[PDB]
Design a protein around this ligand. Structure first.
Ligand SMILES: Nc1ncnc2c1ncn2[C@@H]1O[C@H](COP(=O)(O)OP(=O)(O)OP(=O)(O)O)[C@@H](O)[C@H]1O
Ligand SMILES: Nc1ncnc2c1ncn2[C@@H]1O[C@H](COP(=O)(O)OP(=O)(O)O)[C@@H](O)[C@H]1O
Ligand SMILES: [Mg+2]
Lengths: 193, 347, 44
């Protein structure tokens, strides 16, 4: 019967003291998290809990402590907003895609049936069986235990129908086509490509 | 009244555990608050040792600074080339860091201490016997080699048809040791005249020596840089001088044949049909098949004379099986695949 | 503003200088700023 009064009083007192002290600590952390958040990437994670961060200013700093996030929920390559000057990680950032990458996605879905391609029946069959057939089947390809090839290189003289076949494949597939060009992935800034 | 006290104890224990979890969360908050005061440290490479207490460090994308160590750091760990973390204000070396894996080195530094049986590479018993006779004796017991006097067994040559299993030959020998097993095919050792050297001739022998024995295994040197005297000089350089930790060269391609320049040369025999059956067996293993299958007349009709031909016909029989729900490939299907490929290869 | 974050946060690309996570000043409203458009930011 003593445990009622003694324990309830003590535990509620510790609850309230710890609660307002947690609110104080959280307020201090929030006010200390200066918003600018210089964006940086974790190039590697190493044990002492410590990280090597390459900032968007093209310079890499070692961090004696991780910061305000958890080291377990991190890996190489993640986007983290570090402090402008302290360079300490303040929060993790969701996967960010450049405007060029988003524009790279096919949204108009050009309409080109395979009937518009003449003289390439074997080539169309190879492309559809290497790029589309392993896509919407998958599990049965594993059932036969046969490895579907990872990539296809369409090569030949100009005007043979390479880009035409690619456009037709984008037309007659439900996959999210991601078109691009070689010169697109060439930029002034180091590491931009 | 006992049940009332028991529900009381249940609630009070819940409150105690809640306080414990709150205490853990408060400790994490205090830990991150303490972590807040920490500041980053610039990353650089120690280029040179000026004195005991003076160092030369190059910031990754900064200038070169003359700096000194902190104090309680083992100065021997700071060789030229090591990665260190300078303080951001006094620029003193604070701690050392592992190197960061470099680009170029992806097939030059990867280790494969695997166990690939000679059954996987089928139909080449004589070649694997010869490879063992060449590599095992120097690696196993060099004491007899230094006793007789002849130190260097380097050289070797496996000319034959292209892509018939040259890599598997050095992979078959991987049954005993041969961990690093680098593949630097037609590149990064000569580059026409000299272009790749030292940093592209010596790191082979360094990363082999700092680990278990391996095979630089340069490949298809008929396409290096795409000059002869340069190759003559490169093979006659100090490569055979040190011969670190019994690492051999397993060149594969098509007075260069004397000792010290090229050791025993073996012609990879054209895949015999009686060996074609073994190749087709060990390639057609993983693909899901049926009981009535039989690999006897295929090699009779399949005279494509290439191992990759066998791999591709194994894949192409399955590719035929993709049409219709066939989870297994029938003998007629293999026959169709070979009568397709062995004739398509002619074009 | 390369990416919008939802107090909303905004990731900005200062050409070659750097990438920052910033917020709008009180002068502009969140509706005006859209993803991918170029905006002016103070130097501090
Ligand atoms: N086999 C074909 N059947 C029908 N139309 C074809 C065929 N080959 C080319 N064309 C047409 O001719 C033009 C050739 O352009 P296409 O984009 O196909 O070129 P390509 O093969 O990708 O080569 P390049 O990259 O050199 O321009 C297109 O307008 C296409 O419609
Ligand atoms: N006799 C064989 N047994 C099994 N696989 C073989 C055989 N011959 C060739 N291969 C296949 O060929 C590939 C290796 O080709 P390789 O001979 O290394 O070409 P290259 O000599 O041009 O490097 C391997 O993936 C292997 O599956
Ligand atoms: Mg084109």
């Amino acid at each position: 019967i003593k445990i009622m009064k003694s324990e309830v009083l003590r535990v509620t007192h510790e609850l309230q003291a710890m609660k307002d002290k947690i609110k104080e600590n959280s307020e201090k952390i929030k006010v200390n998290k200066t918003l600018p958040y210089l964006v940086s990437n974790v190039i590697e994670l190493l044990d002492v809990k410590c990280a090597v961060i390459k900032t968007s200013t093209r310079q890499t700093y070692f961090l004696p402590v991780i910061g305000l996030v958890d080291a377990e929920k991190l890996k190489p390559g993640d986007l983290v907003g570090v402090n402008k000057d302290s360079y300490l990680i303040l929060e993790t950032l969701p996967t960010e895609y450049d405007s060029r990458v988003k524009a790279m996605e096919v949204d108009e879905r050009p309409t080109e049936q395979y009937s518009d391609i003449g003289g390439l029946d074997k080539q169309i069959q190879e492309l559809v069986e290497a790029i589309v057939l392993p896509m919407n089947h998958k599990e049965k390809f594993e059932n036969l235990g046969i490895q579907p090839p990872k990539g296809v290189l369409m090569y030949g003289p100009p005007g043979t129908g390479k880009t035409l076949l690619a456009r037709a494949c984008a037309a007659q597939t439900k996959a999210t086509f991601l078109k691009l060009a070689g010169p697109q992935l060439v930029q002034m800034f180091i590491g931009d490509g | 009244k006992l049940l009332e006290h028991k529900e009381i104890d249940g609630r009070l224990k819940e409150l105690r555990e809640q306080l414990k979890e709150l205490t853990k969360q408060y400790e994490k908050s205090e830990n991150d608050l303490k972590a807040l005061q920490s500041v980053g440290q610039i990353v650089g490479e120690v280029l040179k040792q000026l004195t005991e207490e003076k160092f030369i460090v190059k910031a990754t994308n900064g200038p070169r600074y003359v700096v000194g160590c902190r104090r309680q750091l083992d100065k021997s760990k700071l060789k030229p080339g090591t990665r260190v973390a300078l303080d951001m204000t006094t620029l003193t070396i604070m701690r050392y860091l592992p190197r960061e894996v470099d680009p170029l080195v992806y097939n030059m530094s990867h280790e494969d201490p695997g166990n690939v049986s000679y059954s996987e590479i089928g139909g080449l018993s004589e070649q694997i016997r010869e490879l063992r006779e060449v590599i095992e004796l120097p690696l196993t017991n060099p004491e007899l080699f230094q006793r007789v006097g002849i130190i260097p067994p380097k050289g070797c040559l496996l000319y034959g048809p292209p892509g018939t299993g040259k890599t598997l030959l050095a992979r078959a020998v991987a049954s005993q040791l041969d961990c690093n097993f680098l593949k630097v095919v037609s590149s990064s050792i000569v580059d026409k005249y000299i272009g790749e050297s030292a940093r592209l001739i010596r790191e082979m022998f360094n990363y082999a020596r700092d680990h278990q024995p391996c095979i630089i295994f340069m490949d298809e040197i008929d396409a290096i840089g795409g000059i002869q005297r340069t190759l003559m000089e490169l093979l006659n350089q100090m490569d055979g001088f040190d011969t670190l930790h019994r690492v051999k060269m397993i060149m594969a391609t098509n007075a260069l044949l004397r000792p010290g320049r090229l050791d025993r040369k073996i012609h990879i025999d054209l895949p015999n049909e009686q060996a074609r059956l073994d190749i087709l067996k060990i390639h057609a293993g993983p693909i899901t098949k049926h009981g009535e299958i039989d690999y006897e007349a295929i090699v009779k009709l399949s005279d494509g004379f290439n191992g990759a031909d066998l791999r591709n016909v194994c894949t192409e029989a399955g590719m035929f099986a993709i049409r219709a729900d066939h989870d297994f490939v029938v003998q007629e299907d293999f026959m169709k695949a070979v009568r397709k490929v062995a004739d398509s290869k002619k074009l | 503003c390369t990416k919008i974050i939802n107090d909303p946060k905004y990731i900005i690309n200062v050409k070659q200088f750097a990438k920052f996570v910033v917020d709008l000043s009180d002068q502009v409203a969140p509706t005006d700023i859209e993803e991918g458009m170029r905006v002016g930011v103070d130097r501090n």
